[PDB]
Structure 1
């Protein structure tokens, strides 16, 4: 009842406009909502609970497939029920092929500790940040993302370096990073996207955030990230991606081409142009697809990793059956 109306409000907020802007807020709200779902709805066996979770997660994902934090948090919860059921009652590999009613409290405590560990991902990333920045380095970022801004603005407490931020047109939110970071004395620079390659030779390394990392190591980021990665590969400069663990989602690029997110073309082309708006077709995607071959490293709350290892993290977070959801 009350939980149902809260779920409906959450779905409507996702459909219209994200209230809690930070992805961490999305993860915390999704986990809390799943907590009241588990506590309130009645179930005898784990199967009906799993299918109810499948239905609710399907509804929430269908509300807005552009962002996948809700989806992979739901998948993590489903794996939590699977693990708890296997523990209280009793991974695909060649070894497997050759060889061969009180869990509610355990589920609740698992979700609680998941929230506790999710709280400190930013702090862990900041703690390990200092080992990848040396004095008088040149760093370039794209758009706005709180992870990398915390990264740099804490790693500059003991080091001095230069930072270049390219505005992510049309949503010129790189200016926000520039202002916030220059309010910490970092000697930053504000730049357009069209100049990326023009300056890319004189950059030591490039650190970027992301919105979602796929299974193959390819990621979905803000528009223009693919061009930056291509320039990096051309100049062979290392590329660092700062992404917490919950931004890892088990889908794959070729899925119905509902991958990008197209917004109103008002930002790209103002409505004041007039007559020419009929014969002209305008596209304003907000996300770009970066292949895994252009990525050098992954920094998460657990440490450093290579893209070629990303698949393993998939097996430790999501059961293969719950990919389709």
Structure 2
């Protein structure tokens, strides 16, 4: 069928890596909406087994891409809460759809509601320092740049120099930007007033898996007591704790770090190149969500009203 082929198309795109995180969540919702429409299912139990199986294969496709797993769990919570309030229900197939639509308009407004709180956290003559290239943080820095005037230091992330296109994006909007070399984070930390970063994933204890320089960044921010603000919406909120059994690191080709033209020493040197870096929650100051700016120590509560505890493990 069209839907099945689109499911393995999504899974193989996840495996190979061929988009932003908000587009990832939007495509996941579109896929799961299709799954609950076009498949035949009698009651909610079979559909939860189906959604669980497909979420298991999309999660096992790329386990470090947790936006798809989060949106699978959000849809599962929606299914078991739109079936709870009706407790084979005929209108249930419609009801979940509407909630999914109410989720999809909760999305596409996540970046605006995070950007609305920019002026409350960025002041005139401020110096902000960021790391990766996250669309949430650039909209945050481009909504605060409409009124106030500040300096932003975009420390590039070294293997995939992606703070380059961030500082190109920010300098087009008139923010006076500085590109760093990622070795100077402790050097320029004395000047920096706030650190605003984005995440790949917010783990359930308030810790976060982010771009590979963010822990080396957060240690400097904690050393100089600079507040580390984290701009990240509620699809990036994953209910997984940082256990050693599950691997959260992603490792890419060493050609990003040590090129293939080095030659014979590549048979002896072990080059690694991870792309994600665990930041423990005691180095964090705030999470600017789409629903506010609450502390890391509140994140567990945001788990309980987003994901059911039976849906943590799929």
For normalisation by structure 2, the TM-score amounts to 0.97
Q: Which residue is 1:38 aligned to?
A: 36
- For residues 144-170 of structure 1, the C-alpha deviation after alignment (integer angstroms, 9 at most, x for no partner) is 111111111121111111110101011
Query: CA shift at 1:51, angstroms?
Result: 0.4
Secondary structure of the 2:239 match is coil
- For residues 13-52 of structure 1, the C-alpha deviation after alignment (integer angstroms, 9 at most, x for no partner) is 1111xx7711111111110111111111111121111101
Query: CA shift at 1:225, angstroms?
Result: 0.5
Q: Which residue is 2:191 aligned to?
A: 202
Q: Which residue is 1:151 aligned to?
A: 140
Q: 1-side partners of 2:30 and 2:187: how far apart? A: 46
Query: CA shift at 1:219, angstroms?
Result: 0.2
Whether contact under 8 Å (1:139, 1:203) holds in the other structure is yes
Whether contact under 8 Å (1:162, 1:188) holds in the other structure is yes
Secondary structure of the 1:240 match is strand
- For residues 115-170 of structure 1, the C-alpha deviation after alignment (integer angstroms, 9 at most, x for no partner) is 01111111111112111111100100001111111111121111111110101011
- For residues 29-76 of structure 1, the C-alpha deviation after alignment (integer angstroms, 9 at most, x for no partner) is 110111111111111121111101111100111111011011010000
Moved more, 283-292 or 147-156: 147-156
Q: 2-side partners of 1:235 and 1:158: how far apart? A: 28
Higher helix share: 1
Give structure 1 regions of 4+ aligned residues with deviation exceeding 2 angstroms. none
Q: Which residue is 2:203 aligned to?
A: 214
Query: CA shift at 1:2, angstroms?
Result: 1.3
Q: Which residue is 1:251 aligned to?
A: 240
Q: 2-side partners of 1:179 and 1:119: how far apart? A: 24
Query: CA shift at 1:257, angstroms?
Result: 4.8
Query: CA shift at 1:102, angstroms?
Result: 2.6
Q: 1-side partners of 2:61 and 2:152: how far apart? A: 37
Whether contact under 8 Å (1:143, 1:168) holds in the other structure is yes
Q: 2-side partners of 1:20 and 1:244: how far apart? A: 22
Whether contact under 8 Å (1:20, 1:26) holds in the other structure is no
For normalisation by structure 1, the TM-score amounts to 0.94
- For residues 225-264 of structure 1, the C-alpha deviation after alignment (integer angstroms, 9 at most, x for no partner) is 0011001111111110000111000011114352111000
Q: 1-side partners of 2:140 and 2:313: how far apart? A: 34
Secondary structure of the 2:118 match is helix
Query: CA shift at 1:190, angstroms?
Result: 0.7
For the pair 1:70 / 2:93, whether they are aligned, the reply is no
Secondary structure of the 1:131 match is coil
Q: 2-side partners of 1:267 and 1:239: how far apart? A: 28
Number of residue pairs matched?
312
Q: 2-side partners of 1:141 and 1:302: how far apart? A: 22
Distance 1:252 1:35, change over 3 A: same
Query: CA shift at 1:173, angstroms?
Result: 0.7
Q: Which residue is 1:9 aligned to?
A: 9
- For residues 278-304 of structure 1, the C-alpha deviation after alignment (integer angstroms, 9 at most, x for no partner) is 111111000000000000011011111
Q: Which residue is 2:224 aligned to?
A: 235
Q: 1-side partners of 2:289 and 2:133: how far apart? A: 18
Secondary structure of the 2:293 match is strand
Q: 2-side partners of 1:184 and 1:53: how far apart? A: 42
